[PDB]
Amino acid sequence: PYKHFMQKEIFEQPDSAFNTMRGRIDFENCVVTLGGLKSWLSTIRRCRRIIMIACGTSYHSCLATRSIFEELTEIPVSVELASDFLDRRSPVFRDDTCVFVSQSGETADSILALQYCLERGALTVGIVNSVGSSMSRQTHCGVHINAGPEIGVASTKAYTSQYIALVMFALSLSNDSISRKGRHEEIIKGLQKIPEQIKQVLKLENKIKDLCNSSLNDQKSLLLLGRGYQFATALEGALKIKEISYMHSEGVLAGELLPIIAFATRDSLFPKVMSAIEQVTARDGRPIVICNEGDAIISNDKVHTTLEVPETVDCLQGLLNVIPLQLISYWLAVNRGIDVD
Amino acid sequence: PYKHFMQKEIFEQPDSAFNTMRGRIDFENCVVTLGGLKSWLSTIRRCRRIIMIACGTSYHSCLATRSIFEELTEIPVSVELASDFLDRRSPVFRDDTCVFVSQSGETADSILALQYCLERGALTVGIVNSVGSSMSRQTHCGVHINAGPEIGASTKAYTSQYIALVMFALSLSNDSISRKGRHEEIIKGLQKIPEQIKQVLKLENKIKDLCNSSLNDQKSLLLLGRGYQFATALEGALKIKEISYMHSEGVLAGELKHGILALVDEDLPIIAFATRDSLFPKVMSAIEQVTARDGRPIVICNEGDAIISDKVHTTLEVPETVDCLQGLLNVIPLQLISYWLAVNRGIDVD
Amino acid sequence: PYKHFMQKEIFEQPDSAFNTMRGRIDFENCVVTLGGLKSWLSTIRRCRRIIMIACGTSYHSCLATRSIFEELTEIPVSVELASDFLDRRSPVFRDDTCVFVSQSGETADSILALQYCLERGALTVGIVNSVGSSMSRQTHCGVHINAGPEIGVASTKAYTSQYIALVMFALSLSNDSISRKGRHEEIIKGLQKIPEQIKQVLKLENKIKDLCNSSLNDQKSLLLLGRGYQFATALEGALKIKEISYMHSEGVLAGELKLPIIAFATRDSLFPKVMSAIEQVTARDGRPIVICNEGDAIISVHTTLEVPETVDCLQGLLNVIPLQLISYWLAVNRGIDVD
Amino acid sequence: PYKHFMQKEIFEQPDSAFNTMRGRIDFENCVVTLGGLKSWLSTIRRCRRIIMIACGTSYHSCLATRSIFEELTEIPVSVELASDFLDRRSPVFRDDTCVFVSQSGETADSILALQYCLERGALTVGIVNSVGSSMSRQTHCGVHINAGPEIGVASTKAYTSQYIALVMFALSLSNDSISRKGRHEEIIKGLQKIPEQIKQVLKLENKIKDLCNSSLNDQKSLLLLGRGYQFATALEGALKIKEISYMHSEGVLAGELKHGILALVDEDLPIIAFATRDSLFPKVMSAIEQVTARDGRPIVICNEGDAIISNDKVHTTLEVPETVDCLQGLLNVIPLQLISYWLAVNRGIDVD
Ligand SMILES: CC(=O)N[C@H]1[C@@H](OP(=O)(O)OP(=O)(O)OC[C@H]2O[C@@H](n3ccc(=O)[nH]c3=O)[C@H](O)[C@@H]2O)O[C@H](CO)[C@@H](O)[C@@H]1O
Ligand SMILES: CC(=O)N[C@H]1[C@@H](OP(=O)(O)OP(=O)(O)OC[C@H]2O[C@@H](n3ccc(=O)[nH]c3=O)[C@H](O)[C@@H]2O)O[C@H](CO)[C@@H](O)[C@@H]1O
Ligand SMILES: CC(=O)N[C@H]1[C@@H](OP(=O)(O)OP(=O)(O)OC[C@H]2O[C@@H](n3ccc(=O)[nH]c3=O)[C@H](O)[C@@H]2O)O[C@H](CO)[C@@H](O)[C@@H]1O
Ligand SMILES: CC(=O)N[C@H]1[C@@H](OP(=O)(O)OP(=O)(O)OC[C@H]2O[C@@H](n3ccc(=O)[nH]c3=O)[C@H](O)[C@@H]2O)O[C@H](CO)[C@@H](O)[C@@H]1O
Ligand SMILES: O=C(CO)[C@@H](O)[C@H](O)[C@H](O)COP(=O)(O)O
Ligand SMILES: O=C(CO)[C@@H](O)[C@H](O)[C@H](O)COP(=O)(O)O
Ligand SMILES: O=C(CO)[C@@H](O)[C@H](O)[C@H](O)COP(=O)(O)O
Ligand SMILES: O=C(CO)[C@@H](O)[C@H](O)[C@H](O)COP(=O)(O)O
Ligand code: NA
Ligand code: NA
Ligand code: NA
Ligand code: NA
């Protein structure tokens, strides 16, 4: 009963998030098992550093999980846009583990980056959706994310499934640490609840439809403010708004230096986020605030819109925070007469 | 003779570039000596990775030099914005060399990041303009860039930082036979930089005309860049934002086919870096995409180059230098653009 | 009651082994806490490699524990004799952790080696018995082995306490590993029983006095055969016989190549090549002295010295004791004043 | 003309040393080129550490060149005996470069160690004489040392050819260093002279024959004292004496123990000391004085013209040309090969 494949795929996320984890997480014993990697983990872990390489929304899923990889593994992790990585002729060597994220497994720049790394003797790992695609075959090992086919022209469920697979990879790499056992358990217990929480967040759609019916839909640009874990969410929202809604958007690191969406969930509620919000409300700017259920980020003596989402484990919050942006980008396009498919 | 300190500081760059290099480069024998790091180089060469950490324009000078560091040293180099590095609580260890770049040597987020790295046992290196400032005192070793005071947003500090960082990369790679020719190339290039900066500064009249005829009334402008000139595009955007109080965004040229450029107005000001060092197919496609929609791009390119036709555009020509140095010349017209946009708006840039 | 200090210090080892562990191992919870290293462990784990540097018997305690360091930490471990390390001018860097083992903390080549590594920016760790000695002060961090003063001329209790301290250091480095938890616990429970097992091994003394009253004390050379964990023990037994008994001795890697002989044949190091070497000796009616675990029959004429079975990597602590007593009684029989 | 293949192989070393270097060293321009390692050098360097693994005399060739590998490359280098490496189950990983030195390419413990390292993801490099042997096939890359077939039961020319190949490997690894160029040129010019210097050393055979017919023949044991570069040579001399001459021998780190074996030796115990300038340490001189003070009459291997022991006190000298310090072992080993050979002939052993 969906208008477009994009809307269908947004609403499939409870199922795709569940399918990504299926048969890979023992939620009772708190054990992650990635069959595709299991013989390789000890080698993956013995590298000088990890380089995540991807394009577009897949590059965003790398940004969204970089912190949790560095936290859990204590291996340096850098995140590269495949085209820029190639542009700079970035040296890579036998001691590098290069992790390629791609829904299609066919993106030309990701393929060229893969071949470049392979030629230089690096160990390569694919986080891929299309089973047996080029990137899937040509990487040494990997995880098929099992999101199902993506027929929309923009990444929705691929993003949240990539992000989950990447978190499972980080957990897998760090499964031998006693000191990080509590953190592992917390994240694993949080993952179990994500699919039902995504269902809850999808219930924002009517509020989001009301917002996109407003003069929000005739704006020439929309800025998204975020920091920490939620900066990747800001960049991904802005990509979706440009690509889907044909509206200019920019994801801005909040407070570092027209409608505004600010991420103010607890995981990323920094003093600089508060002061950036306060700057907008000082000029009576009417921001749209994504925050956790029950938190009053702005008092009622300032006009603002709130989009409340469940609180999850800090490094998983982006899984839920992205959903309203996917929905906004979709409804803005529909109100603007755009066929998003 | 100058209306503002900012204008003085821009015009000072041939002299500040020369003073940054003074006593440090033997241009005849192609040898770089940085006294403050001399004895620490073998230790820096040895680390797991180099993390460059800075705020604002100093963060851009790190982006502008990341590639040549990687190329000359084959040591991994990442570039972190000080506040974001602290927000992610990025792990740092004894085997990291952390390089802190700061004009003032006093920026709170840079000092906080320094303290975090010191506490974790990392080796710390300062690239600082204010001698004996907190950052200078608290780093293990470093290079005072010797650019002189800034009373103006960073202009001569950016070029001097970028030069100091290039000198640092050359020092780290001074024992390599295979890199000897690339070293010589860059050092001979550096020798010519101060006079080429003098040359680029001659664009100011063309720039004042362009601001008076196409830019003053504008609300936003976009900068397109890729490779070595992506940092330049980010820095130009920051200058335009901070100095001129106009919206600006640096855009990775041609990365998105259906991104901002598929969205732009016909009259929106767009500056493209199209110097030979960063003249990628994706840069040409981006320019095309503007040119077909009847935008008239402002093309920064090398002297004599014909980047586009028939097709209406403004050209700002700059001398060709070594690829990894071209950003030193390319930033200068953006400094001048941002300055003139601001004064034509009654804004006090000092 | 003891005839010599060396004899007293051998017999003191149940107590010095306990004292070395005292306040540092929780045996019910299987937790090792070394207060000297507490805040430095995370840095030591980070390094490119560990270099253990020492002289004489202290060099042997590094060979004796190299394998367990490697096994538990997965960090490359090399073992260097201080003088030879200096002789090769072996390069050292910021990313090396250099571990210095010294009873006295004053040995000239060990000091010169420490100063060399310090100048080169390495992280330095001392395993030292004399509190506040040069090596204790000048290392960045370390563990005082708490063996008490050594008055005897040769290292006895210092060897076994060094070896225990080094094992505790390996356990501390690997205390964050889930996969090594089982092995950790095994080694910790083993360590708990070491002092009482040393008491038991000391009861071999009469058997060893009988052996040293024989024509064994009139021999020109004594060969010690070992492999694996027990190769260090063979080297240390050879050193003791030369230095105390004034009898030539060599520790030989058993059966590597194609006269009294002592063979280490405890279960931890009972390789095919050891059994082959032993069979070569018996085939020529050589009459070996076999050190082996209580109840084991290694050969069906020979002398057997039985020692309790402990965890493989701790067996060296018990196997060295009969060599200490053999070297001591051979000396007494040969009229040498060991003190 | 030779009595035995072993004698032939010893006297063949000028030719085998030349053949190992042939087509690999430009002595004019000081360039080392090892085709087998060509495009692997940048990868070999990019490692946490180098592990040299071998058995018997091949393990000695690794000990003899460890110091120069460490000096030229600044990569950690450890040397392991293949059987002991296996006994310890020493952990090996993807970031290790494991270098296997083997004349035959078929020694069981070296092959087992290789399989262990291969399955753990390490990069493996063979320094092998028998072309297409198991070790040569199974390593990722390597250098065939080109010594020619070795028919004698004990390694002679394979030792000096292995040692030379390992030095060439060390030079290849460090060929991009400006600060190393002078040391590289010094060693390469040294190497060019080694074949003719080996011929000079072989002129010692008459003196050695005489010595092996002496009161030396009747003794049951021989100690060798060495330090630094020449410790490997002392160990290799001891192996040759044990394995060929069937006499007890031990190589001793000279002057390490003030009251070790040297305080126990009989007046007439045969002792060879290496006292060439590259390894002429104060402790070596101390060890030598300890022997002569007890009326021992040592055999001194020293450089042409050097007076290590006063002519007042009764000692034998075997003089060898001086070469670059890290190459002196190539010359110092020759008299031990000849001594082991003639001791054996004088005792009736068939060395073949
Ligand atoms: C593709 C396939 O047959 N998967 C099977 C696999 O799933 P399982 O989840 O174990 O494995 P994946 O589908 O993730 O990976 C399949 C293989 O492809 C490799 N790989 C994967 C992605 C990538 O980008 N690069 C890459 O090299 C992996 O290393 C692995 O060898 O076992 C399950 C039974 O337990 C089956 O239900 C799945 O049908
Ligand atoms: C401060 C000083 O006397 N500098 C002198 C020094 O300059 P030189 O250029 O050699 O050294 P710098 O001024 O760059 O640095 C001075 C000291 O500060 C340290 N440092 C520097 C910057 C930093 O951020 N952190 C930090 O720790 C350096 O390691 C060094 O120990 O020799 C020159 C002659 O060749 C003189 O003309 C300079 O006046
Ligand atoms: C010397 C000292 O006062 N030790 C005290 C310490 O023992 P504890 O066992 O905690 O500490 P150690 O005696 O092993 O070491 C003391 C200090 O010396 C350093 N160190 C040690 C050896 C070495 O070779 N190099 C080196 O630098 C350590 O890093 C530490 O800072 O706390 C105990 C109470 O909890 C006290 O009973 C001990 O008296
Ligand atoms: C055996 C062979 O055909 N050698 C040829 C090789 O000599 P060149 O000296 O170049 O190479 P080597 O004989 O040393 O090595 C031959 C091949 O075997 C490999 N390798 C070698 C030893 C080892 O232990 N492991 C191992 O994998 C090498 O990486 C190489 O691929 O090219 C020359 C052309 O210039 C020819 O004159 C030689 O006839
Ligand atoms: O779908 C989008 C955005 O909604 C594109 O940005 C892709 O994310 C990018 O082209 C990478 O594609 P894959 O490599 O993941 O197939
Ligand atoms: O001047 C500017 C931009 O022109 C500021 O954004 C500074 O670059 C930033 O505040 C860092 O300052 P320093 O740490 O380099 O002193
Ligand atoms: O005692 C012995 C042997 O029984 C000597 O070999 C010492 O072991 C050596 O002199 C190092 O002494 P320390 O550095 O441990 O004090
Ligand atoms: O030759 C001898 C002694 O002269 C043996 O010690 C071999 O050196 C050893 O068996 C290794 O054999 P290879 O691996 O080099 O073929
Ligand atoms: Na694959
Ligand atoms: Na300083
Ligand atoms: Na200390
Ligand atoms: Na091969």
Determine whether B312 is exposed, middle or buried from the number of CB atoms within 10 Å of its CB (0-12, 13-18, 19+).
Answer: exposed
Other beta carbons within 10 Å of D300: 22
Q: Which residues of C touch B93 (CB under 8 A)?
A: 43, 46
Q: Where are the alpha helices (DSSP H) in C37-97?
A: 41-46, 56-73, 82-87
DSSP letters, B153-169, are --SHHHHHHHHHHHHHH
Other beta carbons within 10 Å of A145: 29
**Residue count (chain B):** 350
- The closest-lying atom of ligand 4 relative to the alpha carbon of residue D144 is 14
N- to C-terminal Cα separation, chain D: 15
Assign residue D336 a region (left: φ > 0; alpha: ψ between -120 and 50; beta: otherwise).
Answer: alpha
Query: Which two three-digit tokens encode residue A286?
Result: 């009417």
**Residue ranges of the domains in chain C?**
1-202, 203-339
Tell me how far apart the alpha carbons of residues C239 and D221 are, in angstroms, rounded to a whole number: 19
The distance of B46 to chain C (nearest Cα, Å) reads: 8
CA of C53 to the centre of ligand 11 (A): 16
Query: Which two three-digit tokens encode residue B26?
Result: 């033997």
Q: Which residue of B has its CA nearest to D176?
A: B177
Query: Which two three-digit tokens encode residue C58?
Result: 């202290």
Residue type, C31: V
Q: Which residues of A touch C181 (CB under 8 A)?
A: 178
Strands B31-32 and B25-26: antiparallel
Contact D95 A46 (CB under 8 A): yes
CA of C132 to the centre of ligand 11 (A): 8
* Contact by Cβ (8 Å): A106, A134: yes
CA of B125 to the centre of ligand 10 (A): 8
Contact C178 A175 (CB under 8 A): yes
Strands B123-128 and D96-102: unpaired
Strands (E), A83-207: 96-102, 123-128, 141-144
Class (C level, CATH) for C203-339: alpha beta
- Is residue C268 helix, strand or coil? helix
Q: Which residues of D touch A118 (CB under 8 A)?
A: none
The distance of D32 to chain B (nearest Cα, Å) reads: 15
Method: X-ray
DSSP 3-state percent helix, strand, coil across chain D (nearest 5): 50, 15, 35
Q: Which residues of B touch C121 (CB under 8 A)?
A: 43
- Run of H or E including B250: strand B247-252
Tell me how far apart the alpha carbons of residues B259 and B256 are, in angstroms, rounded to a whole number: 5
- Run of H or E including D158: helix D157-173
Tell me how far apart the alpha carbons of residues A186 and A193 are, in angstroms, rounded to a whole number: 11
Identify the DSSP state of C126. E
CA of B47 to the centre of ligand 6 (A): 28
| A25 contacts: CB under 8 Å, gap ≥ 6 | A31, A32, A33, A168, A188, A191, A192
β-strand partners of C32: C25
Residue D301: phi and psi, rounded to 5, are -100, 115
- Is residue B50 helix, strand or coil? strand
Q: Which CATH superfamily is D1-202 part of?
A: Glucose-6-phosphate isomerase like protein; domain 1 (3.40.50.10490)
Q: Where are the alpha helices (DSSP H) in chain B?
A: 5-11, 13-21, 41-44, 56-73, 82-88, 108-119, 134-138, 156-172, 180-200, 204-210, 230-239, 281-292, 326-343
* Contact by Cβ (8 Å): C54, C182: no
Q: Which residue of C has its CA nearest to B39?
A: C120
- Among all chains, which residue has been given the structure tokens 């082994």? C17
Tell me how far apart the alpha carbons of residues A118 and A116 are, in angstroms, rounded to a whole number: 6
* Sign of the Cα pseudo-torsion (A34, A38, A42, A43, in order): negative
Comparing CA positions, the residue from A259, A297, A261, A251 lying closest to residue A278 is A297
Class (C level, CATH) for A203-341: alpha beta
Tell me how far apart the alpha carbons of residues B98 and B244 are, in angstroms, rounded to a whole number: 33
- In degrees, to the nearest 5, what angle opens at C-alpha B340 toward C-alphas B337 and B343? 150
How many CB pairs below 8 A link A and D?
A: 25
B19 CB near ligand 2 (under 6 Å): no
- Atom 10 of ligand 5 has which residue's CA nearest to it? A56
- Atom 4 of ligand 4 has which residue's CA nearest to it? D144
Other beta carbons within 10 Å of C250: 18
D141 CB near ligand 4 (under 6 Å): yes
Tell me how far apart the alpha carbons of residues D194 and D16 are, in angstroms, rounded to a whole number: 11
Tell me how far apart the alpha carbons of residues D43 and D140 are, in angstroms, rounded to a whole number: 12
Closest partner residue to C46 (CB to CB) among B43, B95, B123 is B95
DSSP letters, D245-308, are I--EEEEEETTS-TTSGGGT--TT--EEEE--GGG--HHHHHHHHHHHHTT---EEEEETT--S
D329 CB near ligand 4 (under 6 Å): no
- The closest-lying atom of ligand 3 relative to the alpha carbon of residue C133 is 24
**Mutual angle of helices A230-243 and A317-335, in 10-degree steps:** 20
Determine whether C192 is exposed, middle or buried from the number of CB atoms within 10 Å of its CB (0-12, 13-18, 19+).
Answer: middle
CATH fold of B202-350: Rossmann fold (3.40.50)
- In degrees, to the nearest 5, what angle opens at C-alpha B59 toward C-alphas B57 and B64? 90
In angstroms, the Cα distances linking A130 to A51, A115, A135, A341, D261 are 21, 18, 9, 20, 72
Contact A49 B263 (CB under 8 A): no
Same fold, A1-202 and A203-341: yes
> What does R_g of chain D's alpha carbons equal in angstroms?
20
- Atom 11 of ligand 2 has which residue's CA nearest to it? B36
Q: Label residues A97-125 b or e (16+ Cβ within 10 Å = b).
A: bbbbbbbbbebebbbebbebbbebbbbbb
Tell me how far apart the alpha carbons of residues C262 and C222 are, in angstroms, rounded to a whole number: 8
In angstroms, the Cα distances linking B109 to A256, B115, B125, C58 are 11, 10, 16, 49
N- to C-terminal Cα separation, chain C: 15
Nearest ligand to residue D19 Cα: 4
Contact C177 A176 (CB under 8 A): yes
Residue D101: phi and psi, rounded to 5, are -110, 125
* Contact by Cβ (8 Å): B232, B321: no
C103 CB near ligand 3 (under 6 Å): no
**CATH architecture for residues D203-352:** 3-Layer(aba) Sandwich (3.40)
CA of A249 to the centre of ligand 2 (A): 45
B23 CB near ligand 2 (under 6 Å): yes
**CATH architecture for residues B1-201:** 3-Layer(aba) Sandwich (3.40)
- In degrees, to the nearest 5, what angle opens at C-alpha D171 toward C-alphas D168 and D174? 155
Chain D partners (3+ C-beta pairs within 8 A) = A, B, C
Contact A177 C175 (CB under 8 A): no
* Contact by Cβ (8 Å): B26, B34: no
